[PDB]
Design a protein around this ligand. Structure first.
Ligand code: HEM
Length: 86
């Protein structure tokens, strides 16, 4: 995956709700390892699915982003999670 491009996809599409790895609408559902794991979201496959299809109050991005875009942003999320979004 292209993590640098994933970072840019994140700025363009995700930072509004998830800047710093937090979650503006559902604060407990962060992009940190503990919350991801609790929610069966600590994987590229789980993140790609949720980004593509949406979940609850998170909108879907399948029509907006290419498959490569989504793979890249999911990989970026996991990379940041590993560094606690520091
Ligand atoms: C940008 C494309 C984007 C990404 C990437 C993304 C990721 C993401 C993950 C990995 C989760 C799971 C977190 C967990 O701890 O379980 C998650 C969850 C929610 N998000 Fe998100 N998200 C992106 C975009 C956006 C945007 C622009 C918003 C705000 C409008 C948003 C909001 C939410 C909400 C709400 C959740 C929780 C859903 C639920 O389980 O009820 N996301 N996101």
């Amino acid at each position: 995956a292209d993590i640098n491009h994933g970072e840019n996809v994140f700025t363009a599409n995700c930072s509004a709700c998830h800047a710093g790895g937090n979650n503006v609408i559902m604060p407990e559902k962060t992009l940190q390892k503990d919350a991801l794991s609790t929610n069966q979201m600590n994987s590229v496959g789980a993140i790609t699915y949720q980004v593509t299809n949406g979940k609850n109050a998170m909108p879907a991005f399948g029509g907006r982003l290419s498959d490569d875009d989504i793979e890249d942003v999911a990989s970026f999320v996991l990379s940041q999670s590993e560094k606690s979004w520091n």
